[PDB]
Amino acid sequence: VKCQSPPSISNGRHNGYEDFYTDGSVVTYSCNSGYSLIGNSGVLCSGGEWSDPPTCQIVKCPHPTISNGYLSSGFKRSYSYNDNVDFKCKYGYKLSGSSSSTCSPGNTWKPELPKCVR
Numbered sequence: 157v158k159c160q161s162p163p164s165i166s167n168g169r170h171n172g173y174e175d176f177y178t179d180g181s182v183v184t185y186s187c188n189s190g191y192s193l194i195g196n197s198g199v200l201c202s203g204g205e206w207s208d209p210p211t212c213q214i215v216k217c218p219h220p221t222i223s224n225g226y227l228s229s230g231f232k233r234s235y236s237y238n239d240n241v242d243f244k245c246k247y248g249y250k251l252s253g254s255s256s257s258t259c260s261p262g263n264t265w266k267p268e269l270p271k272c273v274r
Contacts, residue, residue: 157204167191168212170199177201187212192237194261215261225251225272235259245272 159177162170162185169186177183182198183206195210217235220227222243229242240258245251251270260266 159201159204159206162199162201162206162209165209166211166213168193168210172198179203185210185212190214192261194237211261213261214263215259216263217259217265218263220257220259220265220269222251222253222269223271223273224249225255225270227257229256237261241265243270243272245270249274 159179159181161175162183165185167188170183171186172183179202181201184198185193187193191212192215193210193212196208199206200208215237220241224246225243227241228244230239231241236259238258240256243251243255249272252273253270254267255270257265257267257269
Protein backbone atom coordinates (compact mmCIF):
# COMPACT_ATOMS: atom_id res chain seq x y z
CA VAL A 157 0.00 0.00 0.00
CA LYS A 158 1.30 3.51 -0.78
CA CYS A 159 0.12 7.15 -0.61
CA GLN A 160 0.94 9.25 -3.69
CA SER A 161 0.46 13.04 -3.47
CA PRO A 162 -3.04 13.80 -2.18
CA PRO A 163 -5.91 14.85 -4.44
CA SER A 164 -7.27 18.42 -4.52
CA ILE A 165 -9.86 19.64 -1.98
CA SER A 166 -12.43 22.31 -1.25
CA ASN A 167 -11.11 24.89 -3.74
CA GLY A 168 -7.75 24.15 -2.09
CA ARG A 169 -4.54 22.49 -3.34
CA HIS A 170 -1.97 20.19 -1.77
CA ASN A 171 1.83 20.53 -1.90
CA GLY A 172 4.15 19.28 0.86
CA TYR A 173 7.44 18.33 -0.84
CA GLU A 174 7.22 14.86 -2.44
CA ASP A 175 5.15 12.50 -4.61
CA PHE A 176 4.84 9.36 -2.44
CA TYR A 177 3.69 9.41 1.21
CA THR A 178 2.95 5.71 1.85
CA ASP A 179 1.54 5.95 5.40
CA GLY A 180 1.92 8.02 8.58
CA SER A 181 2.46 10.97 6.22
CA VAL A 182 0.71 14.33 6.14
CA VAL A 183 0.00 17.12 3.66
CA THR A 184 -0.78 20.75 4.28
CA TYR A 185 -3.59 21.24 1.76
CA SER A 186 -3.08 24.65 0.12
CA CYS A 187 -6.12 26.96 -0.17
CA ASN A 188 -7.18 29.57 -2.75
CA SER A 189 -5.74 33.05 -2.04
CA GLY A 190 -8.19 34.45 0.53
CA TYR A 191 -9.43 31.08 1.85
CA SER A 192 -8.79 29.78 5.40
CA LEU A 193 -7.52 26.22 5.88
CA ILE A 194 -9.79 24.66 8.52
CA GLY A 195 -8.78 21.31 10.03
CA ASN A 196 -5.35 19.88 10.92
CA SER A 197 -2.42 21.74 9.30
CA GLY A 198 -1.66 18.64 7.20
CA VAL A 199 -3.68 15.69 5.87
CA LEU A 200 -2.78 12.23 7.22
CA CYS A 201 -2.24 9.33 4.81
CA SER A 202 -2.22 6.23 7.02
CA GLY A 203 -2.82 2.85 5.33
CA GLY A 204 -2.95 4.12 1.73
CA GLU A 205 -6.02 6.25 2.53
CA TRP A 206 -5.57 10.00 3.14
CA SER A 207 -7.77 11.01 6.09
CA ASP A 208 -8.71 14.16 8.06
CA PRO A 209 -8.71 16.69 5.23
CA PRO A 210 -8.92 20.36 6.21
CA THR A 211 -11.10 22.90 4.34
CA CYS A 212 -10.16 25.99 2.34
CA GLN A 213 -13.10 28.28 2.93
CA ILE A 214 -13.52 31.86 4.19
CA VAL A 215 -13.18 32.70 7.90
CA LYS A 216 -13.90 36.39 8.06
CA CYS A 217 -15.47 37.79 11.22
CA PRO A 218 -18.26 39.90 12.63
CA HIS A 219 -16.55 41.57 15.60
CA PRO A 220 -15.44 40.35 19.00
CA THR A 221 -17.79 42.71 20.85
CA ILE A 222 -19.22 42.20 24.35
CA SER A 223 -21.23 43.81 27.17
CA ASN A 224 -18.93 46.57 28.48
CA GLY A 225 -16.07 44.04 28.25
CA TYR A 226 -14.51 44.60 24.80
CA LEU A 227 -10.97 43.53 24.03
CA SER A 228 -7.74 45.57 24.01
CA SER A 229 -5.04 43.18 22.74
CA GLY A 230 -5.23 42.26 19.04
CA PHE A 231 -8.50 43.63 17.61
CA LYS A 232 -9.17 44.78 14.02
CA ARG A 233 -12.02 45.93 11.75
CA SER A 234 -11.94 42.35 10.40
CA TYR A 235 -10.45 38.99 11.44
CA SER A 236 -10.09 35.46 9.96
CA TYR A 237 -9.70 31.88 11.35
CA ASN A 238 -7.79 33.09 14.45
CA ASP A 239 -6.82 36.66 15.47
CA ASN A 240 -7.20 36.04 19.21
CA VAL A 241 -8.78 39.01 21.03
CA ASP A 242 -8.30 39.39 24.81
CA PHE A 243 -11.41 40.85 26.46
CA LYS A 244 -10.91 43.71 28.92
CA CYS A 245 -13.98 43.96 31.18
CA LYS A 246 -14.94 47.67 31.27
CA TYR A 247 -14.60 48.21 35.04
CA GLY A 248 -15.75 46.40 38.22
CA TYR A 249 -17.19 43.51 36.19
CA LYS A 250 -16.38 39.84 35.45
CA LEU A 251 -16.21 38.57 31.85
CA SER A 252 -18.83 35.80 32.02
CA GLY A 253 -17.63 33.51 29.21
CA SER A 254 -14.02 33.93 28.02
CA SER A 255 -11.64 36.89 28.52
CA SER A 256 -9.65 35.61 25.51
CA SER A 257 -11.31 34.53 22.25
CA THR A 258 -10.21 34.09 18.64
CA CYS A 259 -12.02 34.56 15.33
CA SER A 260 -12.40 30.93 14.26
CA PRO A 261 -13.23 29.71 10.77
CA GLY A 262 -16.90 30.22 9.92
CA ASN A 263 -17.25 33.94 10.86
CA THR A 264 -17.53 34.34 14.65
CA TRP A 265 -15.64 34.60 17.95
CA LYS A 266 -14.84 31.37 19.83
CA PRO A 267 -15.16 30.70 22.52
CA GLU A 268 -18.43 32.65 22.91
CA LEU A 269 -17.49 36.30 23.59
CA PRO A 270 -17.12 37.02 27.29
CA LYS A 271 -19.72 39.02 29.26
CA CYS A 272 -18.57 41.84 31.57
CA VAL A 273 -20.97 41.10 34.44
CA ARG A 274 -20.99 41.94 38.11
